[PDB]
Amino acid sequence: MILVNKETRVLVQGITGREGQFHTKQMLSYGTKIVAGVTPGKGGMEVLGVPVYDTVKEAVAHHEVDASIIFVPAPAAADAALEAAHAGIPLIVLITEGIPTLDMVRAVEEIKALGSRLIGGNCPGIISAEETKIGIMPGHVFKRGRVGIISRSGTLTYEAAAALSQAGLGTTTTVGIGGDPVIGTTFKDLLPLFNEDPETEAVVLIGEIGGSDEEEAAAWVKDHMKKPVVGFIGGRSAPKGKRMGHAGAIIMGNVGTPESKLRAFAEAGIPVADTIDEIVELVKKALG
């Protein structure tokens, strides 16, 4: 595992909202240690047995917290991430979709300089199989095993993990890094972490059109990785200049093309699966 495990103590921002409350319940059932909640205006209340505070600072004054997961609505979400970083929370998981790009350009810069790691926005979160769930993913598709996952998408990720789990390979930590164009944590940021986790024997990179995180990740793998990596690219047939759902899934002329991503994987000796099943097949092969 990386980043989080059963001991990770979790704060939920936006806990009183319909999304926050729904997923807080799910996380509680999974075994995640939700110790506190934050919603400005609702301090002093309680949600599913979890005490609620007006501010993150009050929350951490009564509870030790190692991570915060944010369900606050898009217009306020960047501000909520800033608040968590300024309260000293080391790991911040930003779920919310629809945050203005420039809000994130500003916030990512500030949060990183403060020493917090931001995952998101527009992401399903992070799960360490059979240890802790900090996000909105269905726990049942993540059997504990040997493969680490990093993905720019959600449901597609769950399908891969279900396949990996059915094949007896299993998963370690899965991180949904988000569908936005400006995000807190890229493939290349997480790769060194997986590289040094002995429980992770292989890493699957689920990417898609847009930007060049995949190419930069491939270059890093080529030079630094001491274990097999398998890639996958969504949107290989996509048109140019059109957002494909995800704010970040867009080809801008020369930048973010699927071809560039396939080419960079090959040059790095990273095999590219064409289908979910091929992901399982390529990982089996690389692991003997």
Binding site: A74, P75, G98, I99, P100, T101, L102, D103, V105, R106, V108, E109, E110, I136, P138, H140, V141, S151, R152, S153, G154, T155, L156, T157, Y158, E159, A162, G179, P181, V182, I206, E208, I209, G210, G211, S212, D213, E216, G234, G235, R236, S237, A238, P239, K242, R243, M244, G245, H246, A247, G248, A249, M252, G253, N254, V255, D274, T275, I276
Partner: protein, 373 residues
Amino acid sequence: MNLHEYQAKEILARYGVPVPPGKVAYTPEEAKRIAEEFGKRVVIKAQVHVGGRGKAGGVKLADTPQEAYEKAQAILGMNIKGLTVKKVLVAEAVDIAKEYYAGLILDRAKKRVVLMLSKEGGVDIEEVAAERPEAIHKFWIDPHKGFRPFEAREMVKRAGLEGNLNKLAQVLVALYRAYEGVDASIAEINPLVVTTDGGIVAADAKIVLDDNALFRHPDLAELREVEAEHPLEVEASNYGFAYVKLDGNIGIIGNGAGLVMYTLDLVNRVGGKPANFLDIGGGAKADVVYNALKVVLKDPDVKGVFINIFGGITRADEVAKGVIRALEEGLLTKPVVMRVAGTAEEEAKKLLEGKPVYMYPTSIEAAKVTVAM
């Protein structure tokens, strides 16, 4: 969200960018009256959401009101690479001495906004990005401090722009203030022009807005419907779906942008040709699928519909129930092929028995099926 040149110009002017006076015209008669008011040479410019309007013949100079009438007449209703011109901008013609390029976009590798500046204006800036990537000078802007006059002046000298240095730098400063001010994802002045009188002017302008920030720009949120590349984009938004019109005849519905792209990739690989992208969001209950069908079927080009959903927790009949509702309301007149992973896949199958809605266990299989339609 795309804006027209005249809308981009209004925004730029509001932030202090000099702009030729201009007015939109819906008829040759309006174009003429406008030419008469200006009482000088004008340009008639097609207002459509593509570039290369000039090469395509959508930008014509007119020396007299009667010429303005005739040039509007020849442009209104013309086709420019797929789009129909429904309006034109009638602007005072500027006398051009120099054409420069100034543009702002997000650089995703640096997680910062980047100013791109070049002597080679009036031409495809991507063309120069190959012929000579060296002809494009870049400045990555500080997300908190912004872009200051001294930085703008240095960029002007770096790029070797001739003309009044202070006025050039001011345009660049205002360009960025406008970018941040309306949450643009793209703002370019091409060509940024030095007139024969030494004046600095934005002869053309392009702005694309960040859709995520429309909620804080009401005056611009209004334009959403009219600026849409396709009317179904708006409907789909109502339900929180993301729709994209593609050229093809297989309708696509999926839950998750990544999964939908994968679905498009599968279809394309096996000879198919998708009519659209439609992401219905994370969840896939009956109402959601019903609405998604509703939206997709309003597209004449759609021969049939491939629904590809991975529910996991969400039960599979939820999908079937929504498709059934649609069918027994006489909405569903085309064949529907599904791959629905999740709980109780069998009871979902014994819901679609006899009805023109067929399930498969694998996505590639379903994909192939829809190819023969």
